[PDB]
Amino acid sequence: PLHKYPVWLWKRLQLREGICSRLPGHYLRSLEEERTPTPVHYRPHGAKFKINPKNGQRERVEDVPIPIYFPPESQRGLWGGEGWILGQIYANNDKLSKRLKKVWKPQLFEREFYSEILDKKFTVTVTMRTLDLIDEAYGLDFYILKTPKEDLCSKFGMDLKRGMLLRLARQDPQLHPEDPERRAAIYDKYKEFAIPEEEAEWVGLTLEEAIEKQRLLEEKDPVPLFKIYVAELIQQLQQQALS
């Protein structure tokens, strides 16, 4: 026979049926939405069209992203967007020589980074690209706060983002006690990434963590029906009395 929905619509169907159905709207929107990562390992074609030399006509061109592997060890660091390139090469860079296996891996370092909204020093593994992006962004905090989920591609980075966004949203005093002026300075410096708390709690959560959070949020000890029935009795008795 045949299903009533294709195979790739099953995920989107599941996101509407059960516990996943009660998640807040904005989290679902942030989850379903897809964005292409910024190019990292390939030179993107500048324009939508191009003249090729072999014939001379105006042919369309697209940029097809290289597929890159992120081993789980990166999820504990900030690799930027970089990663492994698993593929093949021609031996002598001539097409008539053997097709050989090849893996290109980034050059990783360990370093220390100071987060001001967190006022904490983290030890993180990174790559030269991550340092250059941080410098171009004028600080680690800005780099983690303005970059979107897709370019970071690091659960650690998204957790940092959730912490910083929650710290800004609450305006909680725990950043720098005994100097509120420094608190106000730091908080207002990043005043642009100020989103409400209800949206701050869910930033970066994977789907499973979201389901667990919703369950814990709604799980509750059933109310004794004694209270319910006595309430109904009291309502009926009051109605009878006022009549």
Next chain:
Amino acid sequence: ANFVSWKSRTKYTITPVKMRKSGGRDHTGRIRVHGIGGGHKQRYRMIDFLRFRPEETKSGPFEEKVIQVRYDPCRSADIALVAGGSRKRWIIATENMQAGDTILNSNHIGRMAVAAREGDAHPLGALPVGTLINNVESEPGRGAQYIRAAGTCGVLLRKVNGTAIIQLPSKRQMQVLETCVATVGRVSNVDHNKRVIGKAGRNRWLGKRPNSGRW
């Protein structure tokens, strides 16, 4: 393979412990070194090589007297049970060690070379030039790793500022800090070379087996 290596003891004691043979099998399960397996069951006596170890809450050079000098399956030399203070230790003995003797263990570098008895432990610098030593250590406060086998003499060659050059039995030199503690003499069980084992059964008893292959 669930292979918890037997060498799991932490506390030190003179009582023999229960060896488990390997047969050449490493933790994975495959023949890593051919020609090993079988042979007589053995127990292990934890011979202590830091021959200058002062007992709890004590210091300064200490004297110990031996009790017996017995065969040992694992070694090639003959171990000896030395008693000192309130402590017994298994230590590799030299050739002319009899039950009842006494031995000194010191770290005290004297003004000049102290004539040392043929079983005592002294820092390299403390000895004179041209003597024979055993149980040398690469660096101080580490333990004896170099000469330990049966019937092997290690000559001391020279001393310079803060170091000493010693000759290992393989006919080559090495430098070591003068505060490294060695023992003067020749390791016991001399002429262990001349052991005609006679028949393949003896090899099997020791632990070796004949293995074709070794790819």
Next chain:
Amino acid sequence: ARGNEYQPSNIKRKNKHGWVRRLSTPAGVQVILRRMLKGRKSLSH
């Protein structure tokens, strides 16, 4: 002379083909799932 390669032993049979040995590795869970799918009523030895 051959033919008697099966020297039965309950310990061995339960150790190298049993429920827990299958469930102690992804391949074994795949085996159990195949035999659940095909309909078997003897999933594990």
Next chain:
Amino acid sequence: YEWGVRSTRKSEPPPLDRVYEIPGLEPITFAGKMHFVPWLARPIFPPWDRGYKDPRFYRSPPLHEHPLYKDQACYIFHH
């Protein structure tokens, strides 16, 4: 020469999940669903103390805190 090979000691505990070291965050751990799940954070539970203490699983206080504990070291000669 220390005694006790490395591969026989208890273990180095697994590297902690980094979510704990974000000052404002309270992680999502699998303590809510009473069973391990490999895609959440390993909780940290209180040290459990039995209100009673069953004789079959008693654990004596260390030798120091026994009522009959003397600093000076006796030398007994028992059988």
Next chain:
Amino acid sequence: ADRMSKWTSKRGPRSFRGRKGRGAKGIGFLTSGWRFVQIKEMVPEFVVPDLTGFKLKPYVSYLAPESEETPLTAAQLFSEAVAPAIEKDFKDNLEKYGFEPTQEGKLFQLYPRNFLR
């Protein structure tokens, strides 16, 4: 080489034959040297009533009126259990009428069940 027949205590070598029970509850624990200690508390003490003078028998006469199936529902129980006390006291803060808010300090806990049929 038999895998269809059930697996019970009669099957394996000595060790298996001993370990595997037969659906029978336990009442005690093994101490040192394979010695068994029984506990008087883990042995179900039956509670049989005094049947003397009882005017009911295993069966009921065929001369009995029929009726309708009316299963007891929480509402029905509450209606004649506590409601009349409320109404009587409604003519002039819930434990007085039998409500039990928590179930740690009673011998027969309702949820979870700490007792037996």
Next chain:
Amino acid sequence: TVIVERWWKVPLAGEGRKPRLHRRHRVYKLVEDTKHRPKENLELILTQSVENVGVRGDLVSVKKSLGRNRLLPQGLAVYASPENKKLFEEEKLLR
């Protein structure tokens, strides 16, 4: 960063669809390796002084390693951003 480009043209895909790739679309050429590229120098400003490089208030182009391991993570320097340019001009106007 390693930059690679394909050896085999990937057929176009359209506007909605996404390209379907084949076993030959994973062969690659090494366009370059950004680390071999000639070194670069970054632009920052200072909150303090160090006589080897300069004194407070002014722009400085310093080597990336030197400015990342020493000048930045101590308070000496800040990123030459279009928000702290406008701030340090006051620090000289007051003088």
Next chain:
Amino acid sequence: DALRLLQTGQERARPGAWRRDIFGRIIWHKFKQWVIPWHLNKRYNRKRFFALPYVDHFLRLEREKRARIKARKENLERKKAKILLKK
């Protein structure tokens, strides 16, 4: 049960929870009253109450094998309604 609903509003006397076996199947798991907490139980933490990825495919085939069984039972049940209306 009536007194349970009144006094604690719980439905089932014995506590339990919906979990996933190691086979992906959704099961209702009945709790076994023990004495030590669940994180210190070397036996209960050998159980896998989750499902790794390799079961998803087998979760599909099963879902299909029981749809066929449904369809054949439906289609047949209508053929036997044509025949019963052709005599």
Next chain:
RNA sequence: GCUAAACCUAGCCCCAAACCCCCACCUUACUACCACAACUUAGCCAAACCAUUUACAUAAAGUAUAGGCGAUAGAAAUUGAUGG
């Protein structure tokens, strides 16, 4: 004359529609009851060997293009979408 020979339906195939469902049990599974963990399809096969290579709505179009320019591979812009 034995042996046999004959029969109908039990069901099933392809569509359409609709998104489908008390106790014990991961230890030796079906056993009431004690201190680690998951995250590029190679190749058969064609080239009459084989080594680069070799497939996984309609129309434009088997066109541009790719290719030991051999075998073969191959778009897009735009167009419009209860039954036997």
Next chain:
RNA sequence: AGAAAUAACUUUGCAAGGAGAGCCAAAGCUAAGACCCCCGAAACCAGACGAGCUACCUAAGAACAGCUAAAAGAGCACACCCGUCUAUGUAGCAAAAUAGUGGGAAGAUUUAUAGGUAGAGGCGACAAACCUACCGAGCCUGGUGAUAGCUGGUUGUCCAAGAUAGA
């Protein structure tokens, strides 16, 4: 056990146009009709299952009469293990046995029990020996209806044309 396109041929419609969009058009277009089989390798690659047989190893056990000789891989010889030579047997009692004759039989011996090593891998007192009766490379499922210039087949009636230059 003969599935289908490129043309062509036959019969229809309409005909400088045909076609129910896209295609063709210097009588062409649109539609239909006709024509291209079955069984079979040794193999290859991927993922599972196997060391209850056998090879080796580990843990903890067991056996070895009697005589001769006294600490020995000692001699004769039972239990036990192996399998020299001959005969029986060859769908056999047995997919390697039986009867006799033989080698070892306190050792490099033999053996019960649980564990380990996994397939281009293991193990090997090297014989290409053994890894569940068939190992110069296990077995099962999948790619797989592998491919096969090779072998074998290819089913109603009747008629008619029909054979040995060469590259």
Next chain:
RNA sequence: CCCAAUAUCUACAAUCAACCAACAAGUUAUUACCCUCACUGUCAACCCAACCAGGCAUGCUCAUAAGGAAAGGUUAAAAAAAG
């Protein structure tokens, strides 16, 4: 079918274990507990060899107190087998 925790210890063989002779080198003190016999195997001519002159560890009997039946009836040809 087992064992409450912690520290301590735990140098010298087995061989009738004594003579000679060797090498292959072979638990407790403190703390906690005054609880009692539950649960399972128990059969047979039996298991691995498709049904079987084959395979099957240990204790004891060493020719049996235990266990069994080499000939369905006949005649006494050849060829064959064992003596």
